[PDB]
Design a binder for this molecule. Structure first.
Ligand code: CDL
Ligand code: SF4
Lengths: 115, 95, 148
């Protein structure tokens, strides 16, 4: 790991002294919250196909810098942020129930341009 | 209105640089305000043959917005490949 | 025979043909067709070496302008335009680019007219271009040289 990064460049975000562990527990949380959603839902397939690979690389690659190229997500600090954001979205997507057929068709000529 | 050499040193020393090499006030170095008559070029389509508009127009070659799904396994796909982190400068690194 | 320069096989409307093809070509509708012309009316008109092909064609297409029906747009505007450009070519005051445009407007005349005379006047222009293009070009350089 070497000397920890003095700063991530972006004001706000602080350097994470436990990068891999945060990724692992966050990605496991993703697969949990997804698990509470019906399998046929397209949200399940894509999110698990995305997170489980990301969980695969973080476990495999122990070096931080090589990990950054592995997920092409900048530094780790913004990776833990995105993994956190996917957690909130997945936690909020289960109540929204966005897998049934659309609420209703829009009016006849609501689209189409020009009039 | 040329400064006396005595104060040429004063302005140069007090600012730690050579002002007289490049001054804000312009002088005879400016381009002349009267210039010879210019001959402007023609465009690429100024050809007296094989310049049919049907093979040259740009407006009549725009299609209506292509429709891909209407309300009337597959790998996850990003809108575009993630950007590549910018490299540090070479001409001037950290200031 | 060597004094022959070009032959108008039948009628002015059918394009002229240089002696290189006049060696054999049989005088029938099909044979003239692969000869890039037509039998037409079997009016054999023969220019010699001394004949100025550019002048002869201009005289030919000037006749079409005088005997233009005047109804439809192409044969009226185009053939008179053909007179102006071809007259400039005979003198030589034109520029080399205008050779191909005359070909283009000739195609615009062709097939866009109620009367077949429009295509009857476009063919001689096309035939002249396809067989004697260097002749106008050098004649065109002659004007650009003595006029300076
Ligand atoms: C401090 C004062 C020390 C005594 C005077 C010396 C002085 O200031 O010289 C300024 C004089 C003019 O400034 P500059 O930028 O060098 O002139 C550039 C051009 O040559 C300038 O070219 P120019 O064409 O402008 O030169 C003409 C100019 C020339 O002006 C001068 O020479 C000024 C001196 C009075 C005449 O005169 C005028 O423009 C006429 C109007 C004068 C206005 C009123 C002046 C009052 C002076 C003080 C009165 C008593 C208090 O500068 C020098 O000569 C440098 C030496 C300074 C020595 C300081 C010793 C202590
Ligand atoms: S193209 Fe035929 S119909 Fe039309 S103006 Fe010419 S001669 Fe008359």
């Amino acid at each position: 790991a070497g000397l920890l990064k003095k700063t991530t460049g972006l004001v706000g975000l602080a350097v994470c002294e436990t990068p891999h562990e945060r990724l692992k527990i966050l990605y496991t949380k993703i697969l949990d919250v997804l698990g509470q959603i019906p399998k046929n839902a397209a949200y399940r397939k894509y999110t698990e196909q995305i997170t489980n690979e990301k969980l695969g690389m973080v476990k495999a690659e122990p070096d931080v810098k090589k990990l950054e190229e592995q997920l092409q997500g900048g530094q780790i600090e913004e990776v833990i942020l995105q993994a956190e954001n996917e957690l909130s979205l997945a936690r909020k997507m289960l109540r929204w129930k966005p897998w049934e057929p659309l609420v209703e068709e829009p009016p006849a000529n609501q689209w189409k341009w020009p009039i | 209105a040329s400064a006396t050499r005595v104060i040429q040193l004063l302005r140069n020393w007090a600012s730690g640089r050579d002002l007289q090499a490049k001054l804000q006030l312009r002088y005879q170095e400016i381009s002349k305000r009267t210039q010879p008559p210019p001959k402007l070029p023609v465009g690429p389509s100024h050809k007296l043959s094989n310049n049919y508009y049907c093979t040259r127009d740009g407006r009549r070659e725009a299609m209506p917005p292509s429709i891909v799904m209407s309300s009337q396994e597959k790998k996850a796909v990003t809108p575009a490949p993630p950007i590549k982190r910018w490299e540090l400068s070479k001409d001037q690194p950290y200031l | 025979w060597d004094n022959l320069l070009a032959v108008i096989p039948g009628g002015s409307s059918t394009p002229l043909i240089p002696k290189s093809v006049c060696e054999t070509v049989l005088m029938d509708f099909d044979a003239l067709v692969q000869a890039q012309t037509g039998l037409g009316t079997a009016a054999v008109i023969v220019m010699d070496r001394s004949t100025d092909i550019v002048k002869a064609i201009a005289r030919l297409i000037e006749f079409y302008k005088h005997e233009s029906c005047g109804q439809c747009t192409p044969c009226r505007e185009g053939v008179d335009w053909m007179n102006k450009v071809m007259a400039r070519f005979v003198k030589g005051d034109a520029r080399p680019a205008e050779i191909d445009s005359l070909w283009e407007i000739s195609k615009q005349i062709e097939g866009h007219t109620i009367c077949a005379l429009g295509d009857g006047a476009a063919w001689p222009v096309q035939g002249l271009i396809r067989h004697f293009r260097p002749e106008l070009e050098e004649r065109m350089q002659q004007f650009a040289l003595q006029h300076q």
